[PDB]
Design a protein around this motif. Structure first.
Motif, PDB file in Angstrom:
ATOM      1  N   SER A 274       6.684 -10.991   3.092  1.00 21.01           N
ATOM      2  CA  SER A 274       6.111 -10.102   2.083  1.00 21.01           C
ATOM      3  C   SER A 274       4.684  -9.733   2.470  1.00 21.01           C
ATOM      4  CB  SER A 274       6.140 -10.749   0.700  1.00 21.01           C
ATOM      5  OG  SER A 274       5.187 -11.794   0.611  1.00 21.01           O
TER       6      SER A 274
ATOM      7  N   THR B 138       1.953  -7.959   1.813  1.00 25.66           N
ATOM      8  CA  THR B 138       1.292  -7.085   0.873  1.00 25.66           C
ATOM      9  C   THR B 138      -0.009  -6.612   1.437  1.00 25.66           C
ATOM     10  OG1 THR B 138      -0.059  -7.128  -1.134  1.00 25.66           O
ATOM     11  CG2 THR B 138       0.461  -9.205  -0.091  1.00 25.66           C
ATOM     12  N   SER B 139      -0.450  -5.450   1.007  1.00 23.33           N
ATOM     13  CA  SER B 139      -1.714  -4.924   1.476  1.00 23.33           C
ATOM     14  C   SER B 139      -2.443  -4.198   0.363  1.00 23.33           C
ATOM     15  CB  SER B 139      -1.509  -3.992   2.659  1.00 23.33           C
ATOM     16  OG  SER B 139      -1.093  -4.714   3.797  1.00 23.33           O
TER      17      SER B 139
END
Lengths: 5, 5, 6
Positions: free
Chosen positions: C3, C5-6
């Protein structure tokens, strides 16, 4: 799998 | 992954 | 699980 970031 | 032999 | 995420 080939998966860089 | 699946490389037998 | 993966996962990023950014």
């Amino acid at each position: 799998x080939y998966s860089p970031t």
